[PDB]
Amino acid sequence: AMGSRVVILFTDIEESTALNERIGDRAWVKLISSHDKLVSDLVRRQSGHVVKSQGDGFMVAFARPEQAVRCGIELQRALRREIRVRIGIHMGRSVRRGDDLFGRNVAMAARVAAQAAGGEILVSQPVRDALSSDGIRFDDGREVELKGFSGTYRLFAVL
Amino acid sequence: GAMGSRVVILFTDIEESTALNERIGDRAWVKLISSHDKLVSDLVRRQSGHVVKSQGDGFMVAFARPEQAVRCGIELQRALRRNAEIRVRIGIHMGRSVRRGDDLFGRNVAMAARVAAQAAGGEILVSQPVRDALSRSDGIRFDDGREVELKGFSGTYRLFAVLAS
Ligand SMILES: C[C@H]1O[C@@H](n2cnc3c(N)ncnc32)C[C@@H]1OP(=O)(O)OP(=O)(O)OP(=O)(O)O
Ligand SMILES: C[C@H]1O[C@@H](n2cnc3c(N)ncnc32)C[C@@H]1OP(=O)(O)OP(=O)(O)OP(=O)(O)O
Ligand SMILES: [Ca+2]
Ligand SMILES: [Ca+2]
Ligand SMILES: [Ca+2]
Ligand SMILES: [Mg+2]
Ligand SMILES: [Mg+2]
Ligand SMILES: [Mg+2]
Secondary structure (H helix, E strand, O other): OOOEEEEEEEEEEOOHHHHHHHHHHHHHHHHHHHHHHHHHHHHHHOOOEEEEEOOOOEEEEEOOHHHHHHHHHHHHHHHHOOOOEEEEEEEEEEEEEOOEEEOHHHHHHHHHHHHOOOOOEEEEHHHHHHOOOOOOOEOOOEEEEOOOOOOEEEEEEEO | OOOOEEEEEEEEEEOOHHHHHHHHHHHHHHHHHHHHHHHHHHHHHHOOOEEEEEOOOOEEEEEOOHHHHHHHHHHHHHHHHHHOOOOEEEEEEEEEEEEEOOEEEOHHHHHHHHHHHHOOOOOEEEEHHHHHHOOOOOOOEEOOOEEEOOOOOOOOEEEEEEEOO
């Protein structure tokens, strides 16, 4: 993998299209505007940078894995206080192109988030291995196949 | 009056881009996507459209009128053929959507995304309202459509493939 080491976090609201259809566009745009503000504030708290939005989810860059995980922990807490979000985190080298990130580790991060349940923070093995002392605990992981990748990958939920 | 303004939204997406990336390596991938970005941007510009955002291996694009969106898709599939190896799915839907900065929000954005997701590599699919708006086109031709259900939406939708000359 090429480029600089970065931690990439993806959020994704569960079943947001059905929600949009149920409440209508007026209520949806109000909901997502508030969600954007929330995510943006919590990202900034852990020194992250939002790269882009898919409307109901964000791609976010952090320098350190504990920053990303803490952001995720705070987001889940805030949401608990109705939408559910899945969060995936991976780290590794990726290529900076403009203000965007490219490469297999970006795709890997997206695939990890896709595996996450609503309300769950899932991290890849390298993220798990990099943490411990940081006030963060994990489960024992689950091995899964990821589309586009040849391996099987053990993904760890934050407890 | 209705919430949101009329716009035609086109999504593109490279088929199996992750496997491609893994095969060719990040250096080659960045070169490829850089080239792809420029091709799409140029073709969108020629039809007076606007690229809203990049989604890594595809784009969200806005146009004022459906003929422009469809023409853009036709030229892109044409250009990709000439270049050929990447296959791109294209989906087009039209309706009202809410503007926020340079982005667009609402259910019709989600519908356009799902129309693109139903499309095969190398195919351009459009929703019925796009097909219906272009019933009078002397150049744009469609198949007879196929019925689908779209993630998040109730009921059935008929999606139509563009048949290019
Ligand atoms: C909301 C659904 O439509 C897509 N979408 C909507 N607005 C935008 C936008 N401005 N930019 C980009 N994409 C947009 C993103 C999202 O897709 P999904 O996440 O696939 O929909 P849903 O949340 O219904 O499905 P799951 O997450 O449950 O699979
Ligand atoms: C695996 C997912 O990663 C997405 N991705 C890669 N780079 C970026 C980026 N810079 N910004 C946003 N998203 C990015 C694109 C890819 O999505 P898919 O299109 O779901 O993956 P693939 O093309 O592998 O499979 P199909 O389209 O065949 O499902
Ligand atoms: Ca979602
Ligand atoms: Ca793709
Ligand atoms: Ca669908
Ligand atoms: Mg999604
Ligand atoms: Mg894509
Ligand atoms: Mg449906």
